[PDB]
Symmetry: C7
Amino acid sequence: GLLTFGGIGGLAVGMAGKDILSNFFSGIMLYFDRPFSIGDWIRSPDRNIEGTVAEIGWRITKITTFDNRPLYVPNSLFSSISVENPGRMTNRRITTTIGLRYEDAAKVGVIVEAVREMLKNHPAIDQRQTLLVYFNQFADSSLNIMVYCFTKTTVWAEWLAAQQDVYLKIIDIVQSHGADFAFPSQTLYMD
Amino acid sequence: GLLTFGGIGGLAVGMAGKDILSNFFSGIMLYFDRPFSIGDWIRSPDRNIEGTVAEIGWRITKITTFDNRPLYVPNSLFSSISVENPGRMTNRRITTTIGLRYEDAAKVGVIVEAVREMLKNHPAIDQRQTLLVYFNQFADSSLNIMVYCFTKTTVWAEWLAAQQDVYLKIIDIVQSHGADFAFPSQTLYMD
Amino acid sequence: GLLTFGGIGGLAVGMAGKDILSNFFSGIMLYFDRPFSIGDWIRSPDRNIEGTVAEIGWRITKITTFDNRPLYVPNSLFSSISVENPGRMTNRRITTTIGLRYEDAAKVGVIVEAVREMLKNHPAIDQRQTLLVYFNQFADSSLNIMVYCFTKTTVWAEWLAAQQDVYLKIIDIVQSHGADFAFPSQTLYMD
Amino acid sequence: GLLTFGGIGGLAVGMAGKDILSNFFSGIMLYFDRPFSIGDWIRSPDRNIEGTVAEIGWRITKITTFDNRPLYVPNSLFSSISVENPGRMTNRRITTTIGLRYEDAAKVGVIVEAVREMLKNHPAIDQRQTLLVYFNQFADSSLNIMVYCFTKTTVWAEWLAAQQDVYLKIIDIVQSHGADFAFPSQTLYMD
Amino acid sequence: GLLTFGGIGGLAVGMAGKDILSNFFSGIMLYFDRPFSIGDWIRSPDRNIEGTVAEIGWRITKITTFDNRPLYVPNSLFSSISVENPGRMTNRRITTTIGLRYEDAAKVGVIVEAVREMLKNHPAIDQRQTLLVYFNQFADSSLNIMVYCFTKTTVWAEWLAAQQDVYLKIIDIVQSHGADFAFPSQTLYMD
Amino acid sequence: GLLTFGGIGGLAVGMAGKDILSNFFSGIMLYFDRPFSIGDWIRSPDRNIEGTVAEIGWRITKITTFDNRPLYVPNSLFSSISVENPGRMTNRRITTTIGLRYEDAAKVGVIVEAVREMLKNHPAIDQRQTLLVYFNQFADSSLNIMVYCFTKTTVWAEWLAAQQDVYLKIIDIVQSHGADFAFPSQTLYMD
Amino acid sequence: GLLTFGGIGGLAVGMAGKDILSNFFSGIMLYFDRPFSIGDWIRSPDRNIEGTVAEIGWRITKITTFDNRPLYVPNSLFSSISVENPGRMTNRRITTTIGLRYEDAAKVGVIVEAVREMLKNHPAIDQRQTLLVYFNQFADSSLNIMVYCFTKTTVWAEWLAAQQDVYLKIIDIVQSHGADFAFPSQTLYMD
């Protein structure tokens, strides 16, 4: 009897409150080992925890989303998911595709070399990072050329301006020769 | 025999009714640590619990959906999912895409500067928040320009009016020059 | 040997028969705390239990679907999923989108005001609920206007009649000016 | 040493063989509480167990699919999923959509009333069940009218004949006025 | 110390080695209760175990796929998934859809009766099984007629020949009157 | 106190380190019972373990993918997933679809018989395996004919050459009569 | 009382803190048995851990993504997922599809032989690896030819240059005869 209600109930009690003690243990571990600061935004490819950290409590962490809305995340999630910290980034990346008209195949090399030369001389591009311009796709409606480079600023303000300037220069270079980009461009076979 | 029979019965009973005790423990924890009030609506990216909180019981929480239907949520969910509280937001966000006609590439800069100037002078826009207008997509059928700003009201009533006014002003600015937006716009190669 | 043999047997029994005792405990909890009545239909965003409740047993709950087919739901589901009770609703909602032709942008304001005034004077619309008519989308082929209102009846019979009348009045108002709705409406660029 | 060795062996045995005794306990529960008979077909929205029951054993249940192929289902599934019994249905449902041509908007009311009157006078329709004919969709390429009624037979043979007769009468009624249904019907804007 | 150390070691061993002993227990249960033979092919709607059984071991079962490649399946799967045995089928099913031109609505009845009469007199069709031919779909681009019948052979060789003959006869019957099937068949509305 | 403290510590250790000892037990089982050799490539429909086996360790198995990149797979996966061994295959399969023009329905039989006769006389086709050529699809834009045969070689080099030769012969046979294959081929209905 | 209280508390602690001790055990195992080094990038088909390893701690591993952002991965993941190490690759693979115009079927053999001969004599292609050029797809709008080869460099800089050169040579060879690639190319059946 005494054992029947002492050692049996304590098993249900000790197994039904598992999540709360897990949250508190994860909070303690975060206190001892913190992979992020307060004033930086974090990310996770497994769960949606996008936003800037606001407070770190014993049970839950308050995160301010980009909609200016508070988000409360239990601490136990941080012990089982991959946590990404874009706030500690060193450079911002520019990636795009060109997509010529599938008929201007003789201009691919000169366009690629012109784009590479332009990127090599742009003052806003970090020359110590990766810089690739090549035709490597062979799409079903266009000849695609990849662009891969990095900027030296990470403030989300002049990065966009640099990307816009690069895109405009790319358009100008493309239209300097006869490329004029491409569309879906099927055929019809009328009957 | 008595000890092992009691242990078996207790183990079966405890692991059979884990969910009920979990719900009650979560309700107690909510009573002690409440991340939301009564008269505010909450959200979660993991489960569908959208609606306004009505009552907070020991076992379940009653939430009034936007269809004016009651929704009963077990308390154990709140200890394992991320809870978002839009009712505590400070600003409302306006985001949209323009998408020019891929042929008016010489007007992109002037259109962007005009839209940015108009947004900077709109009385309904919070000037202390993020404000970005840039061409950063380079889509397959249009040249897309992003818009990102915040309003100073959060009442879902004049926020929509301000969004409509901003959209109409954007249309007027776009058609002031020759842009006229864009459509899918493939090609045919008739045969 | 006897003690450990009995413990092994009891542990195996508890492992195998967890679900049945879970169902019975959930049924008991339903008896003590019932979130729904008999003659009302319930819903769940997690599982498919749509239908009207018929009987509530100790193990399973009988639900009559809208195809006039019986559905038997184990009681353990109700302790781990969110349960919605549309049978306790207070109002029925009407939501729709208009989608003008992207060329009649000068009529958007007058159409919106006319629709709002018509909805404000409709005898079947509850004036104490939400009522929003705004242009807030910027779709890829149309200019979309949102409609959001509530009726004062919840009987699925004159709610549909009121919705049909509102839709017909909306069509009449839209065609009073020159809007004539819209289609996908791409472009071709023949060659 | 003997006690702990026996405990280890028993725990391993209980952990490994949970599913078999779970199946047997589920079969015993089915024997005591059977939600279906032998000569009726069952369904489940969670798993694929479609078919007609053939035999109910202690471990597995044999179900004859509609391809005349035997299907063996473990008994433990029936204690954790929702089981639907269409073999106990009282009526068969007819549901369809009309989809007018978006230009015959003045005929919607008369078409709806004609269809409703025809359904009310059809000898094969159960007049005590739900009967709704309304225009409630407002689709992107057609004006859709919903049809919702029940038949008094459940034999899968006269139900199909009644459905075909109803569809033919609907076609005749629709073409009596000028509706002629609708197609995707986009626009082109040639250039 | 010795007792608790032995208990810890045994708990670790039992938790780590659950799957192997589960596989052997499932193999033993298969030996005692076998739902399939060697020279027949099995199927499962839950997992991909398609193929013909070759050997049944204590731990794994070897199955020869239809690509003439060996497949090894652990025995524990058969105790938790539904197993289908097409090798024990009694008949093979023929199902197809016709899809008329949506303009020949006056020929639907005569076409249906002709197809039904043809199927009723075909020597390769089992007359004691289900036989249904009805117009029951009302598709968006065609008027669809369902066909449902069974053959008296199950050898995958003359079943295909009978299906081909039935399809050719259906084509001949359909083209005897003016139906000529149908295509997507949208509309364009030039501008 | 000592006994319960030791039991708690041991239970925590056993619960935390389950995966490592599971991997080692799976490796021991693989050593005792190996379903594959070193120099053959394996496959699994459950997880992505495509590649050729290189080494079999106590904890993990090293597999060389077809990109010439090493892949390390924990041993515990092999005790819970189905493992397919294409390296032990006896024949390679050729499967394809023809898809005539839906207007040449009178040539289906002669085309099928010609293709079957050609396959029956091809020196690279195994005559003791399955060989089926039938019209069994009735697609929405074409009349599809299935092809199913096996080759006597499994070297991935002569198999491709035989497949190419068979495809070219099929094209020649198809164009010998008037078939000319088919395209999507909708209709437009101008307005 | 003391014994059962301590047992319940220890069971709760062990059930709550499983993840942290699992992470530390996985870190220790990584220290003893590591499948990767610091200065190489790893991959996993199960989870998103793409990037280059930076630091290996006791609890978490720091990985630098290709966006120059830090990523923190718990150590327990590496004991349950497949880890791929592209940094230890020996060759880089080139794969592409040609897709002729469905009317130039008489040139397939000569085009295939020309492409194979060109690949056989390219100085940047490893002749000891797989090299396949065959027509094996028979697509719905084109006759597709597969290309499969390997390069002798693995530094991502001249690999792209070699791929671009190969693609340009393929284009030149294809246009040497009359192929001119292909488009979707449906038919219209005007009415």
